[PDB]
Symmetry: C4
Subunit: 103 residues, 4 copies
């Protein structure tokens, strides 16, 4: 259905149009930064291969959760707790940004 594609593309444009908005860019960078930080921390303190440090940071920052790994060190547990709250702040950031992009 052509109606289908036209709608999809319209949406894809409204999407990319947002990837131009400065505030969206900031939020995006902050989460990429947060992901890098997490990849580093868990790689160092919990000693995971970088790929597994990133993976854990992702499933954790997004509240999906990891089914097997849990922070072993006390430093990791404390960091992860703060890490999670950073993620919540980020999402509220994005959410809020959408509530504004309506008017």
């Amino acid at each position: 259905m052509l109606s289908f594609l036209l709608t999809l593309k319209r949406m894809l444009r409204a999407c990319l149009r947002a990837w131009k908005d400065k505030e969206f860019q900031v939020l995006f960078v902050l989460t990429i930064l947060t992901l890098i930080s997490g990849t580093i921390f868990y790689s160092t303190v919990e000693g995971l291969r970088p790929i597994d440090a990133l993976y854990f940071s992702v499933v954790t920052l997004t509240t999906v959760g990891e089914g097997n790994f849990s922070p072993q060190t006390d430093f990791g547990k404390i960091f992860t707790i703060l890490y999670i709250f950073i993620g919540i702040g980020l999402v509220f950031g994005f959410i809020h940004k959408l509530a504004v992009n309506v008017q």
Copy 2:
């Protein structure tokens, strides 16, 4: 209790009246497309039984999370990290939509 049914019925009507929006429809199709790729990917690369690839795909794309399985291959891991953000993109699309339908 009659108000319960009349309201419930008025709501179950909106949930369908909204199942008519071309933008919602797209989001939905995209979600099914995503769920199917995940199923294919996880059954192939991680060699999971099909229904378990869909299951993992579902609980992962919805942030519920799987309590026993975690991608074993570095390939699955990368895909999953990407699969998750797609899922977040989709939920934001849905929410953006409500916001729009609401403020209109």
Copy 3:
């Protein structure tokens, strides 16, 4: 701080004022119903003690997730998938309800 308590109570009133709204009531009942259904299904098909069937239904319906149990039977896995999507619809229901309660 009295300012503190006054605010808290104001909020608690705006909360209970919602537990009167019919649509909120419907949504509430539906999730209680969904929770009961889940408690029953998992108790039967996955054969868990009712308390563990409820628990799993809760952590699952809310995307928190269970760290040890995963559906064993094919019927359970299919049901859980639908169960999750019901939960997402419910939350969108509540979310949407809040977006309306602003105007």
Copy 4:
């Protein structure tokens, strides 16, 4: 890149300017109160080391979820089911707030 910093700074100002709302403050305090009760409850009833009770409390109240531990006692299980809904109540409160701050 200057716009990045000026915007970032304008935003980091709102996140603080909003950290001044009496209703947000309350939500925050309530969250800390909840996190502390959870820590006390889980360390006592499930006999978890304090920092692990807080950790479980945190990942549970935020729906992230814990991958290894699950309450063992029927008491913990009930509390957790309740702890979760409180958490959902809190996140809705926060969101309701944004909605209000936004449409004003």
